[PDB]
A = this chain, B = another copy of it.
Amino acid sequence: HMSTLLALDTSTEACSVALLHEGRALSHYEVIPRLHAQRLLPMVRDLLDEAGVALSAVDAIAFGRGPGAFTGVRIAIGVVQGLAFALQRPVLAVSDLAILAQRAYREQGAERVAAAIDARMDEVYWGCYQLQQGEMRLAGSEAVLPPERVAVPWDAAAADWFGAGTGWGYVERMPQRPVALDASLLPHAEDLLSLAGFAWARGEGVEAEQALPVYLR
């Protein structure tokens, strides 16, 4: 049976939603600072309506669980939980560092990505990812670190790995840097949707009442 998955991300100034239905992906993306709580659900209604898909057809709901903006992530968490509780469908928490990695893979073809997202207080969120059967997969663990301490799990002098995310604003303070980077790249629900597909096929998914594997500071 083919899965129907709904994906949304509000971790940044970007708000985006994506839908998998009958093996087709559909997404929409807007930059709208501070207007997430008012614009997220209409984006969802429009996406479902454009696809001709009813909310009841959705098998699971995926969202970016951060790291990123405090308010944006918290909005996603609540809305997804509410949606999922009412439908009685599971939720899929997905890292925004992974989403960045998957996006950089899709757009640049980079199979090794060091994702870095600006954190508060002179630190960055940091996670390195490598392609594994179409999925950008975490090598090691994610961390929040002074830029001086970030490290990659592969040979640094190799010219094939790519730097993605606003954390790369701190590149001049890092102990290594890639040949190429994009410090303005943001999460995109389309790539969240890709990651949710892999996670859903592994049998992941949590019910709304269940303790959420999202750990905000």
Contact = CB atoms under 8 A, between A and B. Distances in A.
A208 B44 CA distance: 12
Interface in A78-93: 78-87
Nearest to A58: B86
A108 interface: no
A23 interface: no
Interface in A174-214: 208-212
A187 to B, nearest CB: 18
A42 interface: yes
Interface residues of A, number: 29
A77 interface: yes
A85 B41 contact: yes
Contact of A82 (B42, B45, B86, B212): B86
B82 A38 contact: no
Contact of A209 (B42, B55, B71): B42
B85 A44 contact: yes
26 contacts: A37-B77, A37-B78, A37-B212, A38-B209, A38-B210, A38-B212, A39-B209, A40-B209, A41-B85, A41-B208, A55-B85, A75-B77, A77-B78, A78-B78, A78-B79, A78-B80, A78-B81, A78-B82, A79-B79, A79-B81, A81-B82, A82-B84, A82-B85, A82-B86, A83-B83, A86-B86
